[PDB]
């Protein structure tokens, strides 16, 4: 009887870029609009039921983080719904801010273009009425040219925001990829904590029980109600049996 902590892998060929790393294949990504792709899922790494040290469980489809058990009754993958959803909840609120924060680009814009709007209307004024007078000729010519210099300049903000957009993605992609690695380890530690010495650490993300742990025992480990004293002894002889 053995329990493993692991995570999700799938047929995704989506690649994002962090800063130190490029073309990193992830299971779940999201495509902003300007070549910007933010990772939502995690590193796509598909592999005796191994744990998470060298493995992303393709056979695990019910979530991001979860366990793969094996006892007398049978074996199978099972996603931790609580963990997976906290990750999804947090990442969602972040991805949204990015969409929401960049929404200052237009709010402020709405003005430069009700104003751009007012000017080339004012320019079409002078083009239609111009059908001393040619002092007003190169006068208008001076302003129309200043309108282009003005738009190029406003567009400089688009150019210089490109790069706002580009770095925010690479950085949030790392905070994210790190965030997963966190939650995964936390789950392993939470299990390692309960089991203590009633189970052997294999070092591959799996724990080898010294006592037979049925499906109910597994659920107890999952929902954090593992009774250590209950099996303490039978693990204890088993450690010394060998």
């Amino acid at each position: 009887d053995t329990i493993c902590i692991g995570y999700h892998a799938n047929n995704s060929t989506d690649t994002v870029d962090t800063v130190l790393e490029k073309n990193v294949t992830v299971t779940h990504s999201v495509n902003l609009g300007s070549g910007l792709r933010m990772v939502t899922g995690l590193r796509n790494i598909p592999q005796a039921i191994a744990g998470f040290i060298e493995g992303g469980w393709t056979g695990m489809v019910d979530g991001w983080y979860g366990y793969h058990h094996q006892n007398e009754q049978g074996s199978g993958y099972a996603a931790d719904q609580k963990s997976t959803q906290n990750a999804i909840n947090g990442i969602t609120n972040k991805v949204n801010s990015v969409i929401e924060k960049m929404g200052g680009d237009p709010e402020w814009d709405r003005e430069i273009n009700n104003y751009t709007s007012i000017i080339y209307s004012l320019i079409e004024e002078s083009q239609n009425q111009q059908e001393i007078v040619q002092q007003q000729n190169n006068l208008l010519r001076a302003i129309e040219a200043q309108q282009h210099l003005l738009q190029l300049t406003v567009w400089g903000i688009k150019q210089l925001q490109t790069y706002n957009a580009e770095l925010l993605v690479l950085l949030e992609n790392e905070r994210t990829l790190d965030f997963h690695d966190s939650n995964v380890k936390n789950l392993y530690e939470k299990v390692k904590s309960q089991l203590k010495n009633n189970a052997k650490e294999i070092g591959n993300g799996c724990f080898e029980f010294y006592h037979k742990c049925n499906n109910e025992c597994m659920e107890s480990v999952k929902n954090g109600t593992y009774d250590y004293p209950k099996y303490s002894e039978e693990s204890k002889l088993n450690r010394e049996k060998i």
């Epitope: 779940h28 899922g41 719904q81 959803q85 999804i88 969602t92 991805v95 949204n96």
Partner: antibody, heavy 121, light 109 residues
Framework: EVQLVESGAEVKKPGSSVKVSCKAS????????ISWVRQAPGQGPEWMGG????????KYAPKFQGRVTITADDFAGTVYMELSSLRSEDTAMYYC??????????????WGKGTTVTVSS | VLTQPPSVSAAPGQKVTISCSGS????????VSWYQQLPGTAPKLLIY???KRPSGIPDRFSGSKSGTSATLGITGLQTGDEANYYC????????????FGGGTKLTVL
């Protein structure tokens, strides 16, 4: 709290298809699942299907399993329900409803107002 | 499908219970939700997880689940409570799906 807005009423012929949308406020990305629940007059509600955020997994009621398709546009903060092979008894009020977590379950806390689809010859 | 009483009746201040009979595969091992529907309105969540209340729902409503049956209780009954009441849960047995009760039309006598 989240407000769920659904597309306008639809009139369709038997055998044709209809595609309804639902847009969630805030977001646009969601951290909870969304299901489509229908009500014919004057009957009890029927759960049709749902979609999980990020995973995009869909589960469908077996009664509609086969001719319903639930898709999501996460950037648009919009999900869609497309029901094909329409019959006259597909005439109903259709609600989008969000769940509390990413998992489709009996608990839908917020509901769209419903839009009417009429199927007649 | 879950079996509800077609209708149940009582007066202001008085109390009434709406039952929901299912089987082992649905009610037997899943959580039960309750919804209220006035005419011309979307279903509104009353109870979830057998007996929990969303904010906005007063302690005049309450729920219970026993084995294969579940119960909605409404005390201090008022005029606005006149509506249709549906129970809901998870039916794992077929292919897993959410199932609703036939519905109970409440009449405030």
């Amino acid at each position: 709290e989240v407000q769920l807005v659904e597309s306008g009423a639809e009139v369709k012929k038997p055998g044709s298809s209809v595609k309804v949308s639902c847009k969630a406020s805030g977001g646009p990305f969601r951290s909870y699942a969304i299901s489509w629940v229908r009500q014919a007059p004057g009957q009890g509600p029927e759960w049709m299907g749902g979609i999980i955020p990020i995973f995009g997994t869909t589960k469908y009621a077996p009664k509609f399993q086969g001719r319903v398709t639930i898709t999501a546009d996460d950037f648009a903060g919009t999900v869609y329900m497309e029901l094909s092979s329409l019959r006259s008894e597909d005439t109903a009020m259709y609600y989008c409803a969000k769940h509390m977590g990413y998992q489709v379950r009996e608990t839908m806390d917020v509901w769209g107002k419903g839009t009417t689809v009429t199927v007649s010859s | 499908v879950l079996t509800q009483p077609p209708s149940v009746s009582a007066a202001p201040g008085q109390k009434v219970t709406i039952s929901c009979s299912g089987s082992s595969s649905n009610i037997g091992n899943d959580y039960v939700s309750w919804y209220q529907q006035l005419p011309g309105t979307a279903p509104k969540l009353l109870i979830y997880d057998n007996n929990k209340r969303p904010s906005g729902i007063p302690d005049r409503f309450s729920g219970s689940k026993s084995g294969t049956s579940a119960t909605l209780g409404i005390t201090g009954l008022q005029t606005g409570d006149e509506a249709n009441y549906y129970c809901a849960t998870w039916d794992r047995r077929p292919t897993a799906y959410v199932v609703f009760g036939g519905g109970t039309k409440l009449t405030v006598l």
